[model samples]
Target chain A: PIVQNLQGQMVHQAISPRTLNAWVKVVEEKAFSPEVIPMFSCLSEGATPQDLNEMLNTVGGHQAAMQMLKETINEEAAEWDRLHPVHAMREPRGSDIAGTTSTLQEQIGWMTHNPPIPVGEIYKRWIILGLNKIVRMYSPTSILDIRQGPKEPFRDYVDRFYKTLRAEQANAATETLLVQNANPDCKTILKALGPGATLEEMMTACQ
Target chain B: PIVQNLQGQMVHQAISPRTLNAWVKVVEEKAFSPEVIPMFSALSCGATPQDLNCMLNTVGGHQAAMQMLKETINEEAAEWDRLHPVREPRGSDIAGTTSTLQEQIGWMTHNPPIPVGEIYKRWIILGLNKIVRMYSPTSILDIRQGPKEPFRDYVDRFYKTLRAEQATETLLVQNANPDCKTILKALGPGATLEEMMTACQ
Candidate 1:
């Protein structure tokens, strides 16, 4: 095990005193190279403004730190537009993303205009809104309608069924309903194995 | 605590064997009398045919049990209209339930409209057409009266444009100004508020 000094901090014997002292300020805020480095890459990789803000604040003193962040975000925003031109094409005219409907430039302005929450959750709210949109579009009926094509192998049929089942995000009860409603041959064979058979057991019985 | 038999199933000595057997059949099918009994009343309480089918199947075999359910749905459908007269009687809402009822009742032919059916959807569509004709203004200056837009919706558009265009002026003052150029042009020089109001009316 690594040793600790009298102050209860880890002792890095190989590190020089000057290098160690330089990292102390960063270490206190927990925003040193290891944590802050990923966040820089995260910006280049399409991280949202909310994502960037949370990452900056994670090391402490966001107010002082955010002055430099504004310049970085503006440059990154330009880079982001260049990186993903498709989003620009799909963007509606006069739609302000920040306020619900406006231009893309105005949308970016809206994001910067608001004061950062700084402390609590940031991305989760955006994630939940995104999920609701996806859920609204999801149709479970399509999954239940899947059928084996002519000359399709039994293994392939089962594989396709399971693949659709996963894509639909089916629960156990819905899986049972789907199994019962699937191919008549599979259904009859599975039903004979009894009412309480597991999905695996049903699949095995079909084979 | 209740006592269990040697086979691990609960035994009620107080209940008769025939009654217990019936209860056992209900339990094995994941249906109990308490659960199924309420579903029958649910039909009259505005349960859809889909709701009734699921409930009936919950108590075991719906196919064997739903013979009289057809009769019940038919009678209840009439009663439903009497109670909720506001519901559009176009049969669109009830169309899905009718096929299930038809299958059970052995009616494989054309379905006539029930007596209580209001047939008001066509009337609403006709009324909308009349309103649209009356509301549509001849000129762009009269765009405010162009549609039967709710006052709130119109107020939002009116004020948003006003605020964006005239940032220094008070909302009250900006609204009072006659900024619609077309209306002013049609009125000609030295037109009064009374004249514009009269022309619009």
Candidate 2:
């Protein structure tokens, strides 16, 4: 709502128009940097250097607007930060946002990031690049050797078993194979559940 | 669907039950480890070791089931792997998997891991624990200094910018601060966009 009366051209973010006009006045009087003007692109489709300059004419008439624009901008940015801690933490420089956007698009094979890039996507790409090697394809029967050690938690064991189970296929019945092929302590735990219990139940109980 | 005759029980996964019974036959005849029986819990709410042993009674009456169970098991596991690559790769050793799961749950604040854990969560935790230092919270203005270098790609700069953005808080004025806070730069392949446009362009 920074530039009202624009008909249907604005994205309508719940930002303070009064506060925004204060920043506009800064741009009008050269109190702050103008590079920020472009960031406001998300504000309106019709936004331009000319439109912003014209908008500044409206705010310069008032003197009080100058005092709080700084405070209001800080408060607004901080609130946005708190509301989105992860996003705030992961945000790049103002100028780099575009490059980040484009690169992530290419890396993820996306033309546009509709939902926006998440921290996970970045982290995953980093991992693939950092450790670009085939760790090998493990199978279900392999779970037998991935036994619960003295240092391992039962929960971890179940996770391991489930992962290995999920990793490969087995012509042998999955449930039967788990009951029979999972690690030493793991197998004993499920064996006690008899043949009727589901994997969830067994995993739930043991973990 | 292996645990068919289970009356009202068993969640059906799109798997070959004949193959399952073949493994069952292996367990019954000790052709393979009996450790596999408990994992069948996901197959049927009613799956029991005793039932599997009995199921062997039906399959043992046949021979072809035995020869291909191992091969079938391999193909099935491979198919699942192909369906999910990153997962297939990061999956921990069979026994350590449980520990890996619980630790991740604790690290990221989750109880059940509903959709199951993905590789990123694991990677993030690895990064945190591996480099658990306060990497410092940076702001949009920080971009003025974390400039793209000759060795750095625009893509990498963007990634760095996003990370620093996602890291800290800043003032509304900081945007202007970036615009005005100019040390300026010279042109070449590594020249930054802001300078390249205002000065170079």
* Most TM-score-accurate candidate: 1
Q: Give the per-residue lDDT digits (tens) of candidate 1, residues B87-159.
A: 2342333423444322222221225423221222222223223222222323222224224444345444544
Contacts from the true interface found in each model, as a fraction, amount to 0.00, 0.00
lDDT of each: 0.35, 0.34
Q: Candidate 1 lDDT, tens digit per residue, A16-47?
A: 23322322333354332222222222121223
lDDT of 2 by residue, A163-206 (tens): 45433322337557555645577667777877566433554555
Q: After superposition, how far is residue A158 of candidate 2 from its true place, in Å?
A: 0.8
| Over 4 Å off, model 1 | A1-49, A52-122, A135-141, A169-172, B1-201
Model 1 chain A lDDT-worst window of ten: A116-125
Docking quality of model 1: it rates as: incorrect
Query: Model 1 — TM-score against the truth?
Result: 0.23
